[PDB]
Design a binder for these strands. Structure first.
Ligand SMILES: Nc1ncnc2c1ncn2[C@@H]1O[C@H](CSCC[C@H](N)C(=O)O)[C@@H](O)[C@H]1O
Ligand SMILES: [Zn+2]
Ligand SMILES: [Zn+2]
Ligand SMILES: [Zn+2]
Length: 431
DNA sequence: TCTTTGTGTTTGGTGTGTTTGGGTGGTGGCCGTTTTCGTTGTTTTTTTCTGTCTCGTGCCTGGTGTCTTGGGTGTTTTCC
């Protein structure tokens, strides 16, 4: 496996055993209202005489304070000293190591198998106010740092892990994380712990959801590798009307922040229903009402290819194919060929005219609207097609819809045109 | 295929209804003392109005999980 980088990671910052405070007023529980009647659990101390360990307030015990995310304090609770609900104070962190893989920096891995709901590691840092946070953020942006190191302890109170903190700062974002951050009360103070969402084995990376507020900062692309990745690091939108479809997909359709604003502003503010921000359900009316302009940028072509590889909706694919019909720039088409647009168009065909979630007349209109640019694009070799074998799909769909003779004749012309093109070499291999 | 429930009529009976005698409790008479009605005065407290800080209340957005519905079966209770 990857080489250990634990000491090298430790040397990059001032290691802390506990959270540091800018002042004694910050970080106090109940907004500084000292609960003199501290919540004392009614647990009886359970001392195992063999090991001398106080087993009270354990994981499978019925300690009320543990359920309510409050730690027992020695000398005040009936559970006695050294109970099993002093995890933050005793600093009983899980054993972890630091390593590096993929496009990520340093990352945290489990040195041992960790149970579900087990406390992993206490996020450490300096407790700071809002103005100090703004000053440090401006300084780091001037320094060009490309890493988040701020977490919101609570309203108006943040934790900075840049110069001083703990191993938890090296945990990387995952869109399907195995751990999560939670807020707990220890004495008259507030702590942020990290707990295991599931069973984690040795060697596996430990990750948590950042749910990051950008505060107007630019998006950063997410390289977590999870299948459910949204592609960028963020959280909830700063207001409604901000997105209706995912960016790459929205920009593939020619839509931008203004066009996504305009639809919601025209209907939602005038007593017509638009659901919350969720891309699992496509709103066909927005896609139909969207305006379409020809593509002349290769990054937009890459976004179109990503939308083809991602979106399953019939209407979004219809409007993307219509936009491609408007598009006539040869360089963008050559880029789409390099991106293997034929491969995506094969699946787009298959989902609509082999799988039947729609009506035959509308599918016929779709097929006539998608054969045209296939007929129009520049082609110079069958090796372009060989990366997709879309001809096979064309044969299957002309055979299925044999009653619709215009589609069959167009596919005849298309395969006749493609049959005459040249071929390119593949090195023979020993046998 | 196959068990219950009602009102009605002849005859019995036991408990409701009626009738005399008396004794005890309700009815008539007058006298005294005080409980309460009436008035008058004080003054406590209850209402009604004005101004600021405060903290909670109202509303809106996102969503986790608790509430509701369909299927099987078996074991628990029902019937003779
Ligand atoms: N899944 C991911 N893909 C890309 N960058 C990631 C990531 N998870 C974390 N990061 C990067 O790491 C930052 C958090 S700090 C994590 C430790 C740091 N990468 C280091 O090795 O020193 C994020 O702001 C981001 O820049
Ligand atoms: Zn306890
Ligand atoms: Zn305890
Ligand atoms: Zn991701």
């Amino acid at each position: 496996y990857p080489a250990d980088k634990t000491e090298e990671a430790l040397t990059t910052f001032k290691t802390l055993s506990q959270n540091s405070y800018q002042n004694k007023t910050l970080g106090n529980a109940h907004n500084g209202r000292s609960t003199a009647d501290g919540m004392s659990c009614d647990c009886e101390e359970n001392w195992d005489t063999v090991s001398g360990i106080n087993n009270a307030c354990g994981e499978y015990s019925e300690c009320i304070n543990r359920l309510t995310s409050i730690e027992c304090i020695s000398g005040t609770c009936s559970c006695g000293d050294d109970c099993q609900n002093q995890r933050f104070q005793k600093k009983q962190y899980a054993p972890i190591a630091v390593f590096e893989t993929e496009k990520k920096g340093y990352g945290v891995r489990a040195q041992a198998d960790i149970r579900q709901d087990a406390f992993i590691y206490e996020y450490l840092g300096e407790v700071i106010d809002e103005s100090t946070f703004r000053k440090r953020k401006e300084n780091y942006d001037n320094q060009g740092l490309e890493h988040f190191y701020f977490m919101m302890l609570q309203k108006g109170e943040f934790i900075d892990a840049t110069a001083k903190g703990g191993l938890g700062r090296f945990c990387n974002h995952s869109c399907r994380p195995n751990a999560y951050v939670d807020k707990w009360e220890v004495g008259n103070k507030l702590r942020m712990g990290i707990f295991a969402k599931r069973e984690i084995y040795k060697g596996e990376e430990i990750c948590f959801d950042y749910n990051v507020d950008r505060y107007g900062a630019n998006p950063q692309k997410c390289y977590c590798g999870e299948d459910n990745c949204i592609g960028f690091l963020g959280g909830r939108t700063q207001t409604d009307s901000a997105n209706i479809l995912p960016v790459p997909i929205a920009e593939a359709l020619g839509s931008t922040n203004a066009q996504e604003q305009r639809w919601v502003r025209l209907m939602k503010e005038q007593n017509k229903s638009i659901k919350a921000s969720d891309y699992s359900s496509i709103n066909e009316d927005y896609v139909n009402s969207l305006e379409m302009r020809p593509i002349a940028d290769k990054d937009e072509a890459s976004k179109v290819t990503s939308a083809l590889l991602k979106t399953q909706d019939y209407i979004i694919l219809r409007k993307l194919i219509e936009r491609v019909s408007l598009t006539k720039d040869p360089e963008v088409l050559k880029e789409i060929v390099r991106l293997r647009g034929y491969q995506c168009v094969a699946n787009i065909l298959t989902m609509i005219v082999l799988d039947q979630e729609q009506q035959q007349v509308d599918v016929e209109s779709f097929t006539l609207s998608v054969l045209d640019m296939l007929e129009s694009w520049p082609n110079s070799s069958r090796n372009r097609i060989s990366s997709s074998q879309i001809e096979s799909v064309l044969e299957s769909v002309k055979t299925k819809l044999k009653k619709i003779q215009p589609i069959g004749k167009k596919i005849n012309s298309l395969l006749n045109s493609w049959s005459k093109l040249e071929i390119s070499y593949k090195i023979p291999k020993s046998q």
